[PDB]
Ligand binder design. Sequence first.
Ligand SMILES: O=C(O)C1Cc2ccccc2C1
Length: 167
Amino acid sequence: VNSFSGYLKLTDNVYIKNADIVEEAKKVKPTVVVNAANVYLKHGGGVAGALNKATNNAMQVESDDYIATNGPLKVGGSCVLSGHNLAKHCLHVVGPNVNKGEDIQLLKSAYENFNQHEVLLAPLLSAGIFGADPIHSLRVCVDTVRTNVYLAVFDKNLYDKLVSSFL
Ligand SMILES: O=C(O)C1Cc2ccccc2C1
């Protein structure tokens, strides 16, 4: 049994809810919240900007030190950093950004990072301002992630479209 409430069950392991991931993290304090990161961990906008704002910029301070030491992530890759006030840990995952021209086949590789964690609160990778089709992102998620994932979708209109169209 876990703390996640109000989710619709899509499969054995994937659950979905219309929710602000920031507000959901604040309530649940999950072991792992996923950030929709870029390779530079520059948390300017979208989910990353919102998560970072909720940490009072501490996520960005920590991230800048991580990049200064380790250099940029790979598209499709990830790193585990602090969850600050939102979660125990933040898994920063880089999905391909279609608005920068990145290979969408890298979306499966991005979701494979989730399999290293038993339970996660996450957004749809590459969706929103990353330019991918969120329906596609949800299909790759379900067909790739084997661990228990709680997907928070910010847009209500999109949530309803994702549920109604889910196979
Ligand atoms: O409505 C949503 O949940 C989308 C908003 C957003 C922004 C940047 C990255 C992913 C997503 C998912």
